[PDB]
Amino acid sequence: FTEDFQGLRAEVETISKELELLDRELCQLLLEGLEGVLRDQLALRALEEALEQLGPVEPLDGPAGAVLECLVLSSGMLVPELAIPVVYLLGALTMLSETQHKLLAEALESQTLLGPLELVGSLLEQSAPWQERSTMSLPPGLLGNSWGEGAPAWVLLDECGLELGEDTPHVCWEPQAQGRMCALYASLALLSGLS
Amino acid sequence: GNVKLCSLEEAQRIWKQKSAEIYPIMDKSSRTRLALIICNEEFDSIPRRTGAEVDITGMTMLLQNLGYSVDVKKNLTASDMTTELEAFAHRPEHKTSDSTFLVFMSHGIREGICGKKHSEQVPDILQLNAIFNMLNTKNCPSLKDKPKVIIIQAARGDSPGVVWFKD
Amino acid sequence: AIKKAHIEKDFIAFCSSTPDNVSWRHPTMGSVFIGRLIEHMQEYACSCDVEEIFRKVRFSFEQPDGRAQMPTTERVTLTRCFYLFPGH
């Protein structure tokens, strides 16, 4: 496809559009599982090794088993119609730091995904092309009350590679933050579709 | 009450004749059935349904005599009825129920059911399949394998629906 | 343990009239469709299933009197017979 943000948006939403095969009951169970997985460095690696991008997977313990018990048949066989959307989510979580993983668990818990979901989305579309350093500035329409040092929307962008500012042009886009910003948007977009 | 209740002699007779082809009825001592009635009476640009209150009382009494808790919402738009339907689709008491009844009473055209803000220029229509996929197994797993009776009182066109033939 | 299931089944719709035709109501005694439905439901819910009760309501409208209306059963995905058990 395209290397733009609209080419990433179509790449991501094709994983969400057919994720409607997940029921409302399973969506909240997968959400309660991914919340505990994002709080454990070990459970995320244990879950990712179990999925492994044929054979039945053994049941796990803790939050890792909570997610895996939402994606297997009675015999333990992985359903490829639903396991691949999840392994695309984890493929976007390996590119994120553990600090961002915890702040996603706070967003999943207090129902605050839509806060920085569009903020990252608007920053990824106005920063085209990704190959150049550009001095941007978020509008007051995207938050502006939460903004500040140590804020959830601040730490999620600082851990990507962006040099943030409280005043002036608030955000400075660096091309090295491209990989983590696309993964941070993919994580927030897929989790919002599951919500 | 007004419903001629089924005798236990006959209730046993029907379940004995075709047990594997009847939806299982839960016990009255612990079931929590639900029924939703959405009736739009007065409209902002369409003639008011004069006398639509007797239909609300009649259906509510009928559903209560069958063992259903009736929730009635009046005068809503196509988007306002969607908020009350999805809130009705993940109610907690549906997992301890065995059936449900949905009654829709408003104006309507060939497309679907009209809302409060419905006009000729700007529609306000809640189509039929919008109601169906909103309480399907996906958005409402608590009613999987359970009867979902939807009753619709609304016009569907403008023709009288008659034809004259030789007698 | 996750199983596969049909996206929608066990549905049944009972419309007020046939397509392209109008329903009919009375400001004093309510609608003719709502009134006739309550009569048969209060009468045949102890012996007939819902799909057969709706068929009996259509039978009472076989003779067009006044504003002819013919109720229609649409989008039937009932796998079993829905028997209401009044009193149980």
Side-chain angles (χ1 to χ4, degrees), chain A residues 102-183:
Chain A
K102 178 177 59 181
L103 266 49
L104 295 193
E106 283 200 13
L108 290 181
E109 192 184 57
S110 58
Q111 194 186 2
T112 46
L113 288 179
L114 306 174
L117 166 63
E118 189 182 332
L119 179 57
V120 172
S122 296
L123 285 178
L124 278 177
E125 182 159 89
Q126 77 175 8
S127 59
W130 298 343
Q131 301 175 345
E132 292 186 354
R133 286 170 281 271
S134 54
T135 56
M136 317 164 306
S137 60
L138 40 39
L142 294 183
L143 303 185
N145 157 82
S146 180
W147 199 252
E149 281 205 7
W154 182 287
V155 183
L156 241 58
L157 298 175
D158 194 8
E159 288 286 344
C160 289
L162 305 176
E163 192 186 288
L164 298 178
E166 308 143 342
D167 211 313
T168 59
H170 325 95
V171 182
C172 304
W173 166 269
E174 197 87 30
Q176 299 242 57
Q178 165 242 10
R180 187 158 295 186
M181 278 288 291
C182 288

Side-chain angles (χ1 to χ4, degrees), chain B residues 21-139:
Chain B
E21 307 204 45
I22 264 65
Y23 287 102
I25 301 292
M26 292 179 172
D27 190 9
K28 189 177 181 296
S29 62
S30 61
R31 69 164 183 259
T32 57
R33 291 173 173 172
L34 270 196
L36 181 61
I37 293 184
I38 296 183
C39 172
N40 297 323
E41 191 198 25
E42 45 90 5
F43 298 84
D44 304 329
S45 176
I46 254 180
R48 154 153 49 185
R49 305 275 316 283
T50 65
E53 182 52 53
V54 187
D55 298 329
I56 295 181
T57 297
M59 291 302 302
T60 302
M61 184 119 305
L62 179 64
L63 296 172
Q64 287 168 351
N65 293 333
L66 300 178
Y68 293 81
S69 299
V70 185
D71 187 11
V72 176
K73 301 298 170 57
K74 296 198 61 179
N75 303 331
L76 322 171
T77 80
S79 179
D80 309 9
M81 297 182 303
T82 300
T83 306
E84 304 285 2
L85 267 182
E86 299 195 69
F88 185 80
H90 61 73
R91 276 254 207 168
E93 35 178 337
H94 276 104
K95 66 189 61 180
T96 55
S97 176
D98 61 285
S99 64
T100 188
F101 273 79
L102 296 84
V103 183
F104 284 87
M105 296 180 296
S106 179
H107 278 92
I109 54 183
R110 180 186 55 187
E111 185 176 2
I113 309 308
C114 300
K116 176 152 60 180
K117 300 178 181 179
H118 178 252
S119 62
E120 306 85 308
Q121 301 172 345
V122 178
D124 194 19
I125 304 299
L126 177 66
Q127 302 186 62
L128 227 181
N129 46 17
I131 314 173
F132 264 61
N133 83 90
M134 201 172 303
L135 292 97
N136 58 2
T137 309
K138 195 195 81 60
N139 301 95

